[PDB]
Amino acid sequence: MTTTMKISIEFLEPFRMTKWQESTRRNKNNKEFVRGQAFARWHRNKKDNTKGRPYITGTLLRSAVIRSAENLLTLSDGKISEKTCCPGKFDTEDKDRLLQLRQRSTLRWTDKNPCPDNAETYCPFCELLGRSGKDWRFRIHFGNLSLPGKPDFDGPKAIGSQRVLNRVDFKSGKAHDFFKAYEVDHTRFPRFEGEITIDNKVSAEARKLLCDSLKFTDRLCGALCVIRFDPNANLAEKTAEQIISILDDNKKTEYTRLLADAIRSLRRSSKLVAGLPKDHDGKDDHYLWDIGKKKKDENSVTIRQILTTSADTKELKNAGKWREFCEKLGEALYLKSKDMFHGKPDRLEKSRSVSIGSVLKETVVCGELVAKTPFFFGAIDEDAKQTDLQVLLTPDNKYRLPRSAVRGILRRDLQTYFDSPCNAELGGRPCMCKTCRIMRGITVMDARSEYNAPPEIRHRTRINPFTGTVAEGALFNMEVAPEGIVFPFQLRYRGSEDGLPDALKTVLKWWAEGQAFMSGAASTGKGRFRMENAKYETLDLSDENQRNDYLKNWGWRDEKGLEELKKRLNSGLPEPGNYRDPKWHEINVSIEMASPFINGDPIRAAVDKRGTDVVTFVKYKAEGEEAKPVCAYKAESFRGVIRSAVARIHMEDGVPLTELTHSDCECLLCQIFGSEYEAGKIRFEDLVFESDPEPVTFDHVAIDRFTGGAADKKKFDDSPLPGSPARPLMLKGSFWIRRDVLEDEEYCKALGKALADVNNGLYPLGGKSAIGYGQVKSLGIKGDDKRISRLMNPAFDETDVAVPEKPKTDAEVRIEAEKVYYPHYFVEPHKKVEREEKPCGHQKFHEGRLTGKIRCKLITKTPLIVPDTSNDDFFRPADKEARKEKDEYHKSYAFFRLHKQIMIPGSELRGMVSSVYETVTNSCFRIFDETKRLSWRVDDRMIGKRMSADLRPCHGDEKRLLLRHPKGLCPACRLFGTGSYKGRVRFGFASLENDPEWLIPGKNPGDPFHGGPVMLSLLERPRPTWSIPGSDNKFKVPGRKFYVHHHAWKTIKDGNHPTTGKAIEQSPNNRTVEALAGGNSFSFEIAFENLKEWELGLLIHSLQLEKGLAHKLGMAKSMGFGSVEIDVESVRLRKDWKQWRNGNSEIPNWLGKGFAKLKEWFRDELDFIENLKKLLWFPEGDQAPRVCYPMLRKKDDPNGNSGYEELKDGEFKKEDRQKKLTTPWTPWA
RNA sequence: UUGAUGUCACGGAACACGUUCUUUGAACCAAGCU
RNA sequence: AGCUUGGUUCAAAGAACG
Ligand SMILES: [Zn+2]
Ligand SMILES: [Zn+2]
Ligand SMILES: [Zn+2]
Ligand SMILES: [Zn+2]
């Protein structure tokens, strides 16, 4: 009597499943339950077992069929086959106890009254509705749909992952609230099966109505569908426990966070395990990758060997399997590192019936959404915790572009067109505003990418404005999808008006011009797509012929029918009636930097082959399916520097300098850059370099103030991008500014003043600007006709005032031609170190302080050695490969050059000037290896205990930055900075003003830009036991080691030893260098800011000395090398953002103010000043003091001078050694 | 695994807000031993 | 008392969210 119809619904996109509900909570008052009534249900065994399987109720399929029937009946005027249909009853007002009621209006196709209840006959629509006049057999019964075969799964997480969906405010730009739903991918569970039992009494017209309605229902359970009718993951955890043991067995545990983040960095990197940084030699002993070897213990295997074995486990050879290994392994190491809203409907009564436009055109726009920038789509996994900001991925690990986001962006874009937001709330009858009306005829197909590589991790920090450094707890990372990912776009509009609505045409035209800001993190230039290859064709559903094959083809919704429909679509997009300009304008930036640049990324260097401590940031492009790296300045960093430039200028208001909470603020910074509640109107993109600049490595060593030698464990390097005045690094990007800001006169001035400051070199880009990195030569914003760019036109009053002459030197040194002087002496510091006064922050430009640039002219007196240690094999007479990997070859070096230009690194000049500044102001030994324990054949006390606590480095022990040392910061820690406080002076690279003059003529006469080698004597580390004669408590640290000036380099140039006079021989322990002669002129520029009157004076007095002194620079200082002179050429002071002025006339006041502080500091107890002056005293006239180190024994010195064995018991015995080493130019004879 | 004369949930952008940055001369002569 | 011979440092201190 009843026939069963086989129906299978297949989902074309991920569908949504409501979560399991208890029968108690399945009531009508459950907001979460009723919200999920349109979603698939999860059948779960009752008590405590989430094991079960999903299903779709037949009631949901029935209601979806009813809607299609109304739409089909409206399109046919109710004339199905040959008989009419009434509008239906839709009342059931007997009790109204039925979840739930129909809020939307019912479509009206006829004015006839509904069929009377209990009538002997019913129209086809009433037969479909199930109206009736165990005998209650359904006229048409819809059975539930289940997975084929009724499988069983562990729980809802086995099939789908819960996702959070938010509602973003239109004006604020930030989300009011959110709701979560299970998303079950259609690629794993595409098809459902069910039954529709039809009684034999059902009319053929009702059967035709049911079949047509089934072929019309295109969306069920939140997805586009077509209804038809007729031991495994344990490897990554065993490796994790092995690593934690190996780290534990070797102490460590501080590298786990770097190892967790670096191993996870190998997620894309099955082939990257083979290429790892390795040690400084080729020995293969890395401080991170070779932790567990422990001097060749059989039970010990290094972390490198652990991963190499994992790289070839016979199952991780697949890319996907390997990727989940690193994620699981990295996420496991991370855990060890740490350890050690549902809108509701309203029960409104009988819904009004509306005779909507029976024309009902159908429009399909097919295209590709192409990522012009990196994008970011939400979706934080509640299990994964090694990343703070994750991206939405499919279970296949493909990048997903949800229709929930695309629906929201179209809704947001439609509102901007109309200039009217939509204030309708969730619940009640549908909103009838222009935006909601267009969005109810819109269908957007959910999309995924063919590209499958893992996301990049970007590390973002919040900088403390006052301290100039990273704030406490401001390090966080995010997953970023690459540029160039193309998503297949499917837009489908259905409405009465022919073609797309007028607003929809413009928003699609906005998107076509690369102005689709689809994803989140838009402030940092993430999520700008362009709709490409758009096509469209309208379908007239009212036409019987066109509507008939529409049902037969299932609307061409499935992948089989799309290409057939795609042939009909014509290329392009309809021209909007009244096109409106998009609300965002693109400003093209062009920055030029005449210095090296580094935008740091520690994790990428932990995995890089070069092994450098710091490397520059690189992003990836989705070049098809394989990603390619590219060096770029981070958009997050560029926004941060530009935001800082604006904020430090402005005092809004009365008179904080834009450093407020911004909780309830109407701030120039808040409403240009955005707040936590007020998403900004400026969108910075990544900045990329014009050419392909290959990174270079620069070695850095922190010298000890006491021993003058390298401080242990503080030898480092980094791989910045090379730049210079010969080859500036042209950085080219964009930022997007909204209409309401670019048309605002004050914002153009606020941005223009800041961009002028950046133009004036006031804001270096990236990190390590203290040593001359990322100095901006210029900055052009040549988009944006006039407006902002008009303020980037500085005027410098170039009144030619000569810089004051250097004062004559008071220092008097008497040198005898028959004595021999020790190569170095110690300037004993004053007992008082002025630790006051809690230095000024970097958050403003304080009144009274001075900011500007000091142009200096350094000149060499003795030959100068500044080596390029990147190539210690420079001077080798061919046969290079013969001693490669020998580990004992003679080391050779060339002078530092950047892009084939002789230069002095700012780090070199910075320490050389810093050392003199520290002694002049009696500051602490900024670098001092305190932990070293002296042995006298052993001390019971540390070396740092010898000196006073005042001389101790200031860093040594939110408010920890200024509370780290109770006493505070010494004068040179204020100026040159600490780890916790950023320095106020930046030392640029010094460039050779003229063609070089070399100490030794070059081997090839053709090239005058290279010099010959000079072989130095052996250079050995300093012995503090000589300075501190014994373990006696009386003996203390003598003071700052300084190397006197002398001409022992003349003996070395001839090849003779400085002391014995015997010719030096090549050995595996002495160096060969290229040294400039005397007379080479270098210009370098010192940028400072917020300098006091005296600090700028002491700096000048430290930079330029008195007439008759000199500086010591480079290596071989004890051999008379690297005597240099600095003359301050010009002082330019930043009066304001637009006007700069000269201080060439104000120089003598700075020197006077500086010395007055010296007199106040020490009250004419300045013996260290004169002692330093004697040490700095260059030998004037014809006098040639003989300076050298004693030999071990007198018999080893052909000149007859005694040796260390004789001196050790002679005049330098035990108690005359401290006094004879702290007195400059005292001879040991 | 749902009831049935009423399901706009394609009715809802995981959105907004953060500079991998701060400091550090590639430098350096007297001990080691029974 | 016995004569002469030897390279060192290769990252560190922080920040891992308000
Ligand atoms: Zn009827
Ligand atoms: Zn609305
Ligand atoms: Zn503000
Ligand atoms: Zn200090």
From TrEMBL:
Zn(2+) 2 binds at residues 123, 126. Zn(2+) 1 binds at residues 86, 115, 123, 126. Zn(2+) 5 binds at residues 422, 431, 433, 436. Zn(2+) 4 binds at residues 422, 431. This is CRISPR-associated RAMP family protein. It comes from Desulfonema ishimotonii. It comes from the Bacteria. NCBIfam families: Cas_III-E_gRAMP (NF041225). Zn(2+) 7 binds at residues 662, 665, 667, 670. InterPro entries: CRISPR_Csm3_endoribonuclease, RAMP_III_fam. The keyword Oxidoreductase does not apply. GO terms for biological process: defense response to virus. Residues 1191-1229 are annotated as: Disordered. The keyword Lipid metabolism does not apply. Disulfide bonds join 86-123, 667-670. Zn(2+) 8 binds at residues 924, 954, 970, 973. Pfam families: RAMPs (PF03787). Residues 1205-1219 have a biased composition (Basic and acidic residues). Residues 369-530, 637-777, 964-1125 form the CRISPR type III-associated protein domain.
